Structure 1
Amino acid sequence: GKQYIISEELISEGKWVKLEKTTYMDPTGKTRTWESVKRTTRKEQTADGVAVIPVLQRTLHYECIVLVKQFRPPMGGYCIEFPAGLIDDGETPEAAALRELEEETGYKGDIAECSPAVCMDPGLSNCTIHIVTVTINGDDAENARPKPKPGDGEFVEVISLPKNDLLQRLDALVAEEHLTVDARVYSYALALKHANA
């Protein structure tokens, strides 16, 4: 028997996040519940945000993956992640990705590809994002002196690491600093390693 949602009761709602009690039908026709999380900023027929995989390309160097370091309140510490942001109203995933990349890193990129909506943590929330691959011409005079343009309550640090040695460099950051690496960044790094050998 196929499963389906029966009802979604609001438990508590903040200005950005809300908790819900989800009642659904299981394969055996039995009613069960689940505690779900959702963002209050999600628009209809639109993913919550985007994560950007910024590939910095330079003539004299191997490719680099541009990451950002930010203090994350929910984590109680600093985290290393792909640049990311919530999609603004009417804005396409691609546009959101280029804007957030420039805002958080100062780099002006070009779209390479865009994934369909993927889930962030399906066992807990309904949060989804588009993973957008963007290339950056690191030799262009325009990208010589990049500087972020963060908002009021935002201070991002840019950290670019070699694509051919990503996993190792991420491990070093974890060991030497008070940092947590994002699961998507690490999954990306593991496959780069697994593909290689």
Structure 2
Amino acid sequence: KQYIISEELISEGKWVKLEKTTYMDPTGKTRTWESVKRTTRKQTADGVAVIPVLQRTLHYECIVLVKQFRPPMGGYCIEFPAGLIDDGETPEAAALRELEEETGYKGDIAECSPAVCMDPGLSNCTIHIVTVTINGDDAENARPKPKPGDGEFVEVISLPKNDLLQRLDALVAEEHLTVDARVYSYALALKHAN
């Protein structure tokens, strides 16, 4: 019933562009929308986000998260490890790579989502969510070596999976940080389950 008629470029940066989208509404009426896109898409999706499940025997299972300054937010955010997919990289491979660069951990793929949208009333940005387990008792994950690219400055924060929502709430109250909506959604559902 609805579809895109045309897209008019408004402004194109190096990394992000802004378009005016014309579309057909279901009544037969032509309407416009302001849409954002990345200039970097190639690929199945723009990026990946990694759900990294740190598994150490006789310890609580942890979700590994990252804390970074985010210029669009003007502040620090707590997020799943994440980056753009290199041209000719599988989502799985982008996941293990971004997890290593950001956390130093070496992980194993558990499952991989279809492409899923980030904020579809604003942008066409999509990611694959990739669930990865980390054998925290293996020697390669003993002293994890985080390999930042240029301009990445990442702090690693591991939180117990069984208390994740309360732990995130605590960081927000004490540390004046913003939690990512996907991380919060995950945490909420761990509480809502059964």
TM-score, with length taken from structure 1: 0.97
Q: CA deviation at 1:151?
A: 1.5
**1:100-157, Cα deviation, whole Å (9 max, x unpaired):** 0000000000000000000000000000000000000001111110121102211100
Q: State how far apart, in whole Å, the 1-side matches of 2:128 and 2:186 are.
A: 15
Measured against aligned partners, the alpha-carbon deviations of 1:65-94 in whole angstroms (never above 9, x if no partner) come to: 000000000000000000000000100000
How many angstroms apart in 1 are the aligned matches of 2:47 and 2:138?
28
Please say which of residues 144-153 and 119-128 is displaced more in the overlay: 144-153
**1:102 and 2:73 aligned:** no
SS of residue matched to 1:192: helix
- Give aligned-pair identity as a percent: 100
Q: Report the CA distance between 1:176 and its aligned residue.
A: 0.4
Query: Deviations 1:6-56 (Å, cap 9, x if unpaired)?
Result: 00000000000000000000000000000000000001x420000000000
Q: Deviation per CA, 1:133-192, whole angstroms, max 9, x where unpaired?
A: 000000111111012110221110000000000000000000001200000000000000
How far did residue 62 of structure 1 move? 1.8
Pairwise CA RMSD of aligned residues?
A: 0.7
The gaps in structure 2 that reach 5 residues or longer are none
Secondary structure (helix, strand or coil) at the match of 1:62 reads coil
2:53 is paired with a residue whose SS is strand
For the residue of structure 2 that corresponds to 1:28, the secondary structure is coil
Q: CA separation in 2, counterparts of 1:147 and 1:166? A: 24
**CA–CA separation in structure 2 for the residues paired with 1:120 and 1:4:** 20
Q: Displaced runs of 4+ in structure 1, greater than 3 A?
A: none
Equivalenced residue count is 194
Three-state SS of the structure 2 residue aligned to 1:61 is coil
DSSP-derived class of the 1:38 partner: strand
Structure 1 residues 142-151 or 46-55, which shifts more?
142-151
Counterparts of 2:119 and 2:191, CA distance in 1: 24
For 1:92 and 1:151, the matched residues in 2 are separated by 19
Shift of 1:4: 0.5
Candidates 170, 174, 177, aligned match of 1:176: 174
Distance in structure 2 (CA, Å) of the matches to 1:160 and 1:59:
15
Distance 1:190 1:13 in 2: 37
Q: Distance in 2 between matches of 1:24 and 1:12?
A: 19
